[PDB]
Design a binder for this molecule. Structure first.
Ligand SMILES: Nc1nc2c(ncn2[C@@H]2O[C@H](COP(=O)(O)OP(=O)(O)NP(=O)(O)O)[C@@H](O)[C@H]2O)c(=O)[nH]1
Ligand SMILES: [Mg+2]
Lengths: 128, 209, 996, 11
């Protein structure tokens, strides 16, 4: 005989798409990029609740972390056929839960519409 | 804590403040608002060796706004020298920034960054960029606009400051977000803000994303 | 609060300053920010320097003293000569005394290096002002003081280092030519005494901090001192032995020896050649015995990044490459020097394996220098056979993606040379590498890609016969590699590399038609593959092969019934049915490349007609429906279809150029009608929805139609050979369709692409349409100028295209500006000067060129009323505006063209090319020459803009400038001297005699 | 040369 020498594990990925996330700066009446990367819908195996979790490329820092609440409504932005705007009441990407008006843009209108499909599925999951 | 003073220097307009802002908030500031003297921002990265905090001293590149100038460099532990690959003069001035920096900071790791490589008509050609060689500076082409190599300067500095060449950025822990409880008292308020946001066009709609 | 230190009516509270300083450097957040603004205001107080003596004496905060010296630095640099002579002496005295006392306290000397270094630099600023003319004893007394104290001696090495830097390394842009020469000659005159001290310190040890500082100063000296100080003393032996053994001195010593390798040296002196060999021999011996042997794994050492290993390996690469590029011939004939030569190159081989992009580029530059010499120089290549064999493997294994682009081209260049030097060894290495992909020992996606790029990079080097067997072998091995893999992820990677290699060997394809045909058909199959990236690869490879082998698609090959281009066109719908629009356009562009090689015009137009059958049929239907129901354009799908049809025409026009005219004629009239219909819809939408409409997908889609139409016309006209048809068929409908629409849209709906299209029209046929050019100006000049003349940022594309258009109009149809009403010609001049003030290079350069071309246009008219009025109205405007951007420190990028413009303006008066008085006759005696008046005007202008200059400075500057207005290089030197003097008080007026 | 063609088509 010779002797020899994130907190995402509890979750299931329902949907994943590349996206660019914006937040509306009301004071400046300006949209401001918050991050670009993979947006994931994560389903908790113990609570069955689905959240959005999005991290920036390379640095991997969180730019979105909130429940896909059934109260939310995806609306179109005047300048895009591949984006959705919605109000978020509690996102903890940068610390304490805070309300944001988000906009999320995708590589194509097809991806945007699929996102909306999955988004509304996740809302019903969270309703039960 | 594990905290390192970083000074960022270079000609006015080269993108120093836009680069830092990209790292602080993820935004790309299109306007040029000149820095007055210095602006100090904490910046944290999560690594396989724990968090590393850079105290970024973003200095003014315009002479009329130079402030304390090399007085900002005192006790810097690392630095970024910035130039603009679309402006030859900004590279011509790299030796001047480096001179003033290393006279105060005699042995610190320094990254030299050629910014704005997203622009088609590049003026400072890759093969003209050789100043870093004899000065032992790390060099990267970068673009705060496209994010090309935007993480490399801090990754390299982190490895040098911690003394671990295998240091890597890692994914910050992601806690469970809280459940929503809509406040009826703010329904009309959030509907006002949403309408404005819907009717303000997203920028850069021709970008791939 | 902290703001008390800004009250100079009270004594300075040093304790409060130290609190402000501490709050800034050690504090955080809002407090730190407030302190910063207070400190900046304190430092900028023009009387703050008076309180520097107090701070340096009574402060206990070293940062406070640093700021005190910065305050003095600004005073010494800019206002020294304005001081009473008593303050000059006083400041000198307490800077010297402060340095002496800091050096005499070992604890202060140990712990306040930052403050001592700052004080030393401040001393050097005084020396630049006072020495040697008012400080002749400085160097003799410095040498004397060095002997009484190791601390003072070490600090004196720092002072001398900074002095050398300020005089020889950083003087060009910071002092006048005369003052720089004065300080350089002063240092050269006394360097014999400086070197003696330096050499004594180095020879006699023994404090390493003293030795290091001395070697740091020597590094600076090596930039300028004569070689005799290095070759007629024993210093090379010390550098290359003694100081290489100790790591403390090793880093700086290696940098010194790198600069020694760059000294100006007589190259017909045998003793000096032996000394140059000897110090290299010594250095390499010290490395192998004290640092690492030749066999060491420098890749691993560099990656571990212990201590200063990375900087040392970088510096060793710089030393070896520098020395060998200059001196390796010294080592190549003497048999006793062969081991040294090859050991040095073996270290370079090991350094070239390091994973570090910028270091690899440094070593690759050297390798290029070497192999180019072996390629041309008789009897050299056999020396380096084993080095080159290892280098082949290094470069193959580190090949980067061709399309990083620059690095690939540099690697390809070296590998091509290495292939000529030994084709057999190159082939064997590549085949062997391929064998290790097949056997899995080195299989990976990255590894097979890297090898395929290397194989592709040497095409055109081997003989056609060897190449053929080589290509066959590679493809055979690659096909087998793909067959044995599974999953289609792996098969996709290898199939792409197969197509990449064949695309790199057009010579093989042109000789084997059946092979070339099979490749293309297989590319067409891959155009149906959905796997991510396969379709882009197939389209990219297709046009790449076409560009190189086009002739073989346009002739009828043996055994074939028709040229293959016919066969491609017959099936184009099927081939491209699964492609994205962008990929379809590439496919059509490739077909146009082939068609343009058909010399028979009737056959070429027939092929063009057949190629464009699908877009033309979609076009005809849409035109028929859009005309019947203008509402159909509201359909986003129709707008997208229309844009892609036009883009297909652009793509084919891009490759066919002049030969595209028949297809353009098929669509031209209906296309411009569509431009108008789309224009009406855009305007109607903006009217009904507001400016925000321009952001909407619908309007952006409509404007894409307009932009692609403009691009198509611009593309054809830029390449047309029949310019009569351009003028008589294309131009008038074009201008009628685009100009009024541009003029009468609100600014946010105007397409900058209109300006770009008009620039090409003027460039190509401007000389033939004088009235058309006038119409272009009338429609775009004033309304575009009003968009861009309120700031420097709004409408960035219109701004750039605007000055491109004025530039070409001024070049090709200057008469159009002669027709302008006087008020509009004034706006033209205003617009040019406006361009001067841009920091935007894309505008400033055209503005300076327009001004210069305009002056020449006026000069060509001779002595006529328009030219006489131009000079009376605008000569001094251009002189003063050029002077403003030259001297305001915010337009340094334009210096060379500003200088050219000013010299042209001055030489007009100096050459008496302005036939009318530039003054109003009531202003100076009648008969006064324009030369005299120009001198007076400029003297008065500069006196008011730079009131701190003496009248003598201004007069001497202008005297030099005006007699140098035929010699641009000297003219520019005088301007640079002026830019130095305006930054300080008391500049010497005789500096402007430097040229004389 | 021709033995490659068949292999080429089966990719
Ligand atoms: N196209 C492009 N623009 C950039 C990039 N980075 C910064 N910019 C732009 O360059 C301009 C100047 O940016 P800024 O960050 O203020 O430069 P700075 O070095 O901080 N200037 P100062 O030293 O005077 O404070 C801004 O308009 C910014 O949007 C880039 O990577 N690409
Ligand atoms: Mg800034």
């Amino acid at each position: 005989h010779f002797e020899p020498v994130t907190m995402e594990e509890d979750e299931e990925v329902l949907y994943k798409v590349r996206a660019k996330l914006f937040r509306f700066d009301a004071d400046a009446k300006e949209w401001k990029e918050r991050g670009t990367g993979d947006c994931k819908f994560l389903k908790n195996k113990k609570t069955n609740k689905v959240r959005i979790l999005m991290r920036r490329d390379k640095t991997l820092k969180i730019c979105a972390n909130h429940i896909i609440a059934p109260e939310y409504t995806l609306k179109p932005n005047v300048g895009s056929d591949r984006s959705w705007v919605y109000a978020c009441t509690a996102d903890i990407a940068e610390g304490e839960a805070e309300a944001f008006t988000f906009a999320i843009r995708f590589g194509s209108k097809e991806n945007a519409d699929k996102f909306k499909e999955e988004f509304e599925k996740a809302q019903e999951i969270n309703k039960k | 804590q594990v905290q390192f003073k970083l000074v960022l220097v270079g000609d006015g307009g080269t993108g120093k403040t836009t680069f830092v802002k990209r790292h602080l908030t993820g935004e790309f500031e299109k306007k040029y608002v000149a820095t007055l003297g210095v602006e100090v921002h904490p910046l944290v990265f999560h690594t396989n060796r724990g968090p590393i905090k850079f105290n970024v001293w973003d200095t003014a590149g315009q002479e009329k706004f130079g402030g304390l100038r090399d007085g900002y460099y005192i006790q810097a532990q690392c630095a970024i020298i910035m130039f603009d690959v679309t402006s030859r003069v900004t590279y011509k001035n790299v030796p001047n920034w480096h001179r003033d920096l290393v006279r105060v900071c005699e042995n610190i790791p320094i990254v030299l960054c050629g910014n704005k490589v997203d622009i088609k008509d590049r003026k400072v050609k890759a093969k003209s960029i050789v100043f870093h060689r004899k000065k032992n500076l790390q060099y990267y082409d970068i673009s705060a606009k496209s994010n090309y190599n935007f993480e490399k300067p801090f990754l390299w500095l982190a490895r040098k400051l911690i003394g671990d060449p295998n240091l890597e950025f890692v994914a910050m822990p992601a806690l469970a977000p809280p459940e929503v409880v809509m406040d009826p008292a703010l329904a009309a308020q959030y509907e006002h803000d949403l309408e404005v946001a819907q009717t303000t066009a997203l920028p850069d709609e021709d970008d791939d994303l | 609060s902290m703001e008390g230190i800004l009250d100079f009516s009270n004594d300075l509270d040093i304790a409060l300053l130290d609190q402000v300083v501490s709050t800034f450097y050690q504090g955080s957040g809002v407090q730190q920010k407030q302190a910063q603004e207070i400190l900046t205001k304190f430092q900028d107080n023009p009387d703050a320097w008076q309180k520097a003596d107090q701070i340096l004496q009574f402060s206990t905060n070293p940062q406070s003293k640093f700021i005190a010296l910065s305050i003095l630095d600004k005073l010494i640099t800019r206002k020294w000569k304005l001081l009473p002579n008593d303050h000059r002496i006083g400041i000198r005295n307490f800077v010297v005394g402060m340095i002496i006392s800091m050096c005499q306290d070992d604890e202060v000397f140990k712990t306040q290096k930052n403050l001592i270094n700052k004080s030393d630099l401040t001393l050097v600023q005084i020396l630049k002002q006072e020495w040697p003319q008012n400080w002749p004893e400085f160097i003799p007394e410095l040498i004397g003081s060095s002997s009484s104290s190791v601390n003072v001696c070490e600090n004196n090495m720092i002072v001398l280092k900074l002095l050398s830097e300020e005089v020889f390394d950083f003087s060009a842009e910071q002092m006048t030519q005369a003052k720089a020469l004065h300080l350089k000659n002063s240092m050269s005159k006394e360097f014999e005494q400086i070197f003696k001290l330096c050499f004594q310190v180095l020879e006699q040890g023994s404090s390493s901090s003293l030795i290091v500082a001395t070697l740091e100063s020597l590094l600076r000296y090596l930039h300028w001192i004569p070689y005799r100080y290095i070759y007629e003393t024993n210093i090379l032996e010390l550098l290359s032995t003694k100081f290489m053994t100790s790591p403390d001195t090793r880093a700086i010593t290696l940098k010194c020896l790198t600069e020694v390798s760059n000294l100006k040296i007589p190259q017909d002196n045998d003793l000096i050649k032996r000394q140059t060999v000897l110090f290299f021999q010594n250095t390499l011996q010290q490395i192998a015995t004290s640092v690492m042997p030749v066999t060491a794994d420098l890749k691993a050492t560099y990656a571990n990044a212990n201590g200063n290993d990375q900087s040392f390996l970088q510096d060793l690469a710089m030393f070896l490459t520098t020395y060998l590029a200059r001196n390796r011939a010294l080592l190549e004939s003497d048999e006793s020097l062969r081991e040294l030569l090859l050991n040095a190159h073996q270290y370079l081989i090991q350094l070239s394996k390091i994973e570090e992009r910028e270091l690899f580029k440094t070593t690759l530059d050297y390798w290029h220098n070497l192999v180019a010499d072996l390629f041309y120089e008789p009897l050299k290549k056999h020396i380096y056979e084993e080095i080159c064999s290892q280098l082949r493997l290094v470069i193959i294994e580190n090949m980067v993606r061709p399309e990083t682009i620059q690095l690939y081209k540099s690697e390809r260049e070296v590998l091509v040379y290495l292939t000529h030097l030994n084709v057999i060894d190159t082939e064997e290495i590549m085949i062997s590498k391929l064998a290790r992909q097949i056997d899995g020992s080195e299989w990976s996606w990255h590894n097979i890609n890297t090898l395929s790029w290397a194989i592709g990079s040497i095409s055109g080097t081997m003989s056609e016969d060897t190449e053929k067997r080589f290509v066959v072998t590679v493809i055979k091995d690659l096909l087998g590699l793909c067959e044995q893999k599974r999953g289609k992820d792996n098969k996709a990677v290898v199939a792409s590399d197969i197509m990449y290699v064949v695309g790199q060997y057009p010579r093989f394809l042109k000789a084997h038609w059946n092979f070339l045909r099979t490749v293309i058909l297989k590319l067409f199959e891959f155009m149906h593959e959905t796997h991510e990236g396969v379709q882009d690869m197939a389209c990219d490879t297709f046009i790449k092969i076409v560009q190189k082998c086009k002739y073989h698609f346009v002739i009828q090959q043996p055994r074939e019934s028709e040229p293959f281009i016919q066969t491609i066109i017959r099936d184009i719908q099927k081939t491209t049915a699964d492609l994205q629009p962008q990929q379809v356009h590439t496919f059509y562009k490739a077909c146009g490349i082939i068609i343009s090689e058909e010399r028979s015009v009737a056959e070429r137009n027939r092929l063009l007609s057949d190629l464009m059958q699908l877009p033309n049929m979609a076009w005809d239907t849409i035109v028929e429906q859009s005309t019947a129901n203008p509402t159909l354009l509201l359909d986003s799908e129709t707008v997208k279809i229309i844009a892609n049809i036009i883009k297909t025409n652009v793509a084919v026009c891009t490759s066919m150029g002049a030969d595209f005219y028949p297809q353009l004629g098929h669509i031209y009239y209906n296309m411009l009608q569509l431009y108008r219909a789309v224009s009406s819809m855009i305007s109607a939408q903006v009217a009904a929805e507001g400016l925000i409409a321009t952001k909407t997908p619908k309007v952006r889609g409509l404007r894409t139609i307009k932009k692609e139409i403009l691009k198509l016309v611009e593309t054809y006209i830029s390449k047309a050979r029949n310019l009569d048809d351009v003028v008589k068929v294309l131009v008038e409908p074009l201008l009628n369709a685009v100009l009024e629409d541009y003029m009468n849209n609100v600014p946010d709906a105007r397409d900058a692409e209109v300006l770009n299209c008009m620039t090409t029209v003027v460039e190509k046929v401007g000389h033939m349409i004088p009235q058309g050019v006038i119409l272009i100006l009338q429609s775009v000049f004033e309304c575009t100028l009003d968009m861009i003349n309120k700031d420097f940022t709004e409408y960035p594309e219109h701004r750039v295209e605007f000055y491109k258009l004025l530039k070409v109009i001024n070049e090709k149809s200057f008469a159009a500006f002669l027709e302008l009403p006087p008020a509009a010609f004034k706006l033209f001049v205003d617009a040019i000067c406006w361009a001067f003030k841009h920091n935007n290079r894309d505008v400033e350069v055209n503005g300076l060129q327009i001004a210069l071309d305009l002056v020449k246009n006026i000069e060509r008219m001779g002595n006529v009323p328009f030219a006489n009025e131009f000079h009376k109205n605008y000569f001094f405007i251009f002189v003063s505006e050029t002077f403003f951007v030259l001297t305001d420190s915010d337009h340094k990028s334009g210096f060379s063209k500003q200088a050219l413009l000013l010299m042209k303006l001055i030489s007009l008066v100096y050459d008496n090319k302005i036939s009318v008085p530039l003054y109003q006759e009531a202003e100076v005696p009648q008969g006064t020459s324009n030369q005299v008046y120009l001198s007076q005007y400029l003297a008065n202008m500069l006196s008011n803009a730079f009131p701190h200059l003496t009248s003598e400075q201004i007069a001497s500057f202008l005297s030099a400038l005006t007699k140098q207005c035929k010699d641009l290089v000297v003219f520019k030197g005088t301007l640079r001297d002026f830019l130095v003097q305006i930054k300080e008080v008391g500049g010497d007026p005789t500096d402007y005699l430097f040229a004389e | 040369v021709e033995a490659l063609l068949a292999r080429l088509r089966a990719l």
